[PDB]
Design an enzyme around this catalytic site. Structure first.
Site, PDB file in Angstrom:
ATOM      1  N   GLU A   1       0.826  -1.201   0.000  1.00 58.07           N
ATOM      2  CA  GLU A   1       0.000   0.000   0.000  1.00 58.07           C
ATOM      3  C   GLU A   1       0.862   1.254   0.000  1.00 58.07           C
ATOM      4  OE1 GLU A   1      -2.024   1.764   3.574  1.00 58.07           O
ATOM      5  OE2 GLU A   1      -3.780   0.881   2.602  1.00 58.07           O
ATOM      6  N   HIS A   2       2.019   1.195   0.659  1.00 60.96           N
ATOM      7  CA  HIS A   2       2.955   2.311   0.607  1.00 60.96           C
ATOM      8  C   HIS A   2       3.423   2.569  -0.816  1.00 60.96           C
ATOM      9  CE1 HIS A   2       4.381   3.920   4.585  1.00 60.96           C
ATOM     10  NE2 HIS A   2       3.534   2.991   4.989  1.00 60.96           N
TER      11      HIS A   2
ATOM     12  N   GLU B   1       7.522   5.419  10.616  1.00 66.70           N
ATOM     13  CA  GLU B   1       6.108   5.236  10.917  1.00 66.70           C
ATOM     14  C   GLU B   1       5.921   4.273  12.077  1.00 66.70           C
ATOM     15  OE1 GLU B   1       3.327   5.936   7.560  1.00 66.70           O
ATOM     16  OE2 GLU B   1       4.198   7.607   8.683  1.00 66.70           O
TER      17      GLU B   1
END
Ligand SMILES: CCCCCCCCCCCCCCCCCC(=O)OC[C@H](COP(=O)(O)OCCN)OC(=O)CCCCCCCCCCCCCCCCC
Lengths: 54, 445
Positions: free
Chosen positions: B59-60, B136
């Site tokens: 998804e990144h 993150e």
């Protein structure tokens, strides 16, 4: 001599009878209560701690 | 026009299915905007230990580059029409949606096809993307709420893939490779588990014809034969305590094994959950809120942010509460919160059940406001349930549940069930697991 022993200890029969029951049920209570203890104390006996300093 | 008539209007969720497996589903009412996105069914549940965290990385890298759109040119397009492209990856579902004007619908679906099918996955972006995730991970480490829910999933569904975090341990993210991500995409981004969705000024015929001429290239077969199956998870009632006295407050989460998506018991339980309600120190209701636990908390300034949850996966879920209080309140709160649950399991009153039904109705209706929440509902419902539940059906189920039903379902899920408590910070008054399980049953009953 048996008569004199009875005279000294009239409860000689019943005492022994009572003892018999104490032998049986305490042979039953003692494990289960122990089984209860290890039941309720197992949380502490399976803690598996961990240390994660920065 | 009363409530019932408005519920009947409820523009429909026409659903179709092209040959390859992808099922489109739109909801057109009037709006000039739209929210078109796909809802690939993937997440930490479909991930082994070796590759735990691949989905987050994919998804990144989705928006970074494509074979068609070389690099940031995709971003240039998306910002050219002012669209707000976004993506979220839960433990079960991973979705990409574009919020854009309806007139630009033809371009948006094309953009979605490029991102979800022709993704470059280029190595240098992988290296650069690696640093972002690691940072993150530290940011989420500071996310004193999120780490508690991760602890909940780890300590409840131990061993099972559900315990795995969404982002992944900070060792797989440092050892991943193009190979591992490409298998994730090949084994999960497949047409049967893909729900093209739209809401707003989106004609269903438009969405169908666009899907045929953009998404038909998606395949349904699975490499040689390998099909990632479903691994049912087990709820191991346990406790995890990360005692860290430096943290100011003490997040605690307690949950029991609640139902799955298909189980109708969601409808009663939610009402029961709505009974306990939610509270924050800045609410303003104070000692007048009808929820007993909220009234007690505001009266004695016990908590700061207690709130119930109903995290519900496909076959099992978590049902319980998460409260944030100072160090010398936890022992009290675990008394009151549990003391509330047993009350619902023994003496729920139709007077409060009506309030819970009203709260649930308002939550369902208000949540379905705006195109993006509608698209989220469509994409999530076609996967979890297999059909978008109309609000009329929700109303019927809410009408069915009453005091007896709530009592029965709470007794069936709450009473005498081993919890899955999970602490963090200066948790010391937090009662031992023996005490917490002790509170799970009422000696009066
Ligand atoms: C507290 C109770 C639980 C603690 C543990 C108690 C003792 C272990 C239990 C097992 C041994 C006793 C078993 C038993 O009761 O056997 C029966 C016997 C009486 O003879 P038997 O003829 O068998 O009686 C039944 C038929 N009629 O009776 C006995 O053997 C009695 C044994 C002696 C008494 C044991 C308890 C002593 C402590 C005091 C308890 C009572 C306190 C009373 C307080 C004031 C009340 C006004």
């Amino acid at each position: 001599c048996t008569f004199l022993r009875w005279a000294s200890e009239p409860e000689h029969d019943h005492r022994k009878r009572m003892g018999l029951k104490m032998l049986m049920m305490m042979g039953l209570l003692l494990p289960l209560v122990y089984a209860m203890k290890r039941h309720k104390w197992s949380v502490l006996k399976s803690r598996k701690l961990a240390y994660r300093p920065p | 026009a009363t409530y019932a008539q408005a519920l009947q209007s409820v523009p429909e969720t026409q659903v179709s299915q092209l040959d390859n497996g992808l099922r489109v589903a739109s909801e057109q009412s009037s709006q000039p905007t739209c929210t078109v996105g796909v809802w690939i069914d993937a997440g930490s549940r479909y991930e082994n230990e070796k590759n735990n965290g691949a989905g987050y990385f994919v998804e990144h890298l989705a928006f970074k580059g494509t074979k068609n759109r070389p690099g940031s040119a995709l971003e240039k397009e998306v910002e050219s029409m002012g669209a707000h492209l976004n993506a979220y990856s839960t433990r079960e579902h991973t979705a990409y949606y574009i919020k854009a004007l309806s007139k630009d619908l033809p371009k948006a679906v094309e953009l979605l096809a490029d991102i979800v099918q022709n993704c470059s996955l280029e190595d240098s972006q992988i290296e650069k993307e690696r640093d972002v995730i690691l940072q993150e991970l530290q940011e989420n480490d500071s996310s004193m709420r999120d780490v508690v829910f991760d602890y909940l999933h780890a300590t409840a569904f131990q061993g099972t893939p559900l315990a795995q975090s969404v982002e992944g341990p900070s060792e797989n993210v440092r050892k991943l490779s193009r190979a591992d991500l490409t298998e994730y995409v090949s084994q999960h981004y497949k047409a049967p588990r893909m729900v093209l969705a739209a809401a707003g000024g989106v004609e269903h015929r438009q969405l169908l014809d666009l899907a045929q001429k953009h998404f038909s290239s998606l395949s349904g077969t699975y490499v040689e034969d390998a099909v990632p199956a479903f691994t049912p998870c087990r709820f191991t009632g346990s406790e995890i305590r990360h005692r860290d006295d430096a943290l100011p407050l003490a997040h605690v989460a307690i949950a029991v094994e609640g139902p799955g998506w298909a189980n109708p018991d969601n409808v009663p339980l939610q009402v029961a959950n709505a009974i306990i309600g939610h509270y924050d120190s800045t609410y303003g209701g104070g000692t007048h809120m009808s929820s007993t636990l909220a009234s007690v908390a505001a009266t004695r300034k016990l908590c700061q942010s207690f709130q119930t949850f109903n995290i519900c996966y496909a076959e099992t879920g978590l049902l319980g509460a998460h409260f944030v209080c100072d160090n010398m309140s936890i022992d009290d709160m675990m008394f009151f919160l549990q003391g509330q649950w047993m009350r619902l399991c023994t003496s729920a009153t139709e007077s409060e059940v009506v309030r819970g039904k009203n709260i649930l109705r308002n939550a369902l209706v208000s949540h379905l406001d705006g195109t993006t929440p509608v698209c989220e509902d469509i994409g999530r419902s076609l996967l979890t349930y297999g059909r978008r539940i109309p609000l009329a059906e929700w109303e019927s189920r809410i009408a069915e549940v009453d005091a007896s039903v709530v009592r029965e379902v709470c007794s069936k899920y709450f009473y005498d069930q081993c919890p899955a408590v999970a602490g963090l910070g200066p948790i010391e008054q937090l009662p031992d697991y023996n005490r917490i399980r002790s509170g799970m049953f009422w000696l009066r009953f």
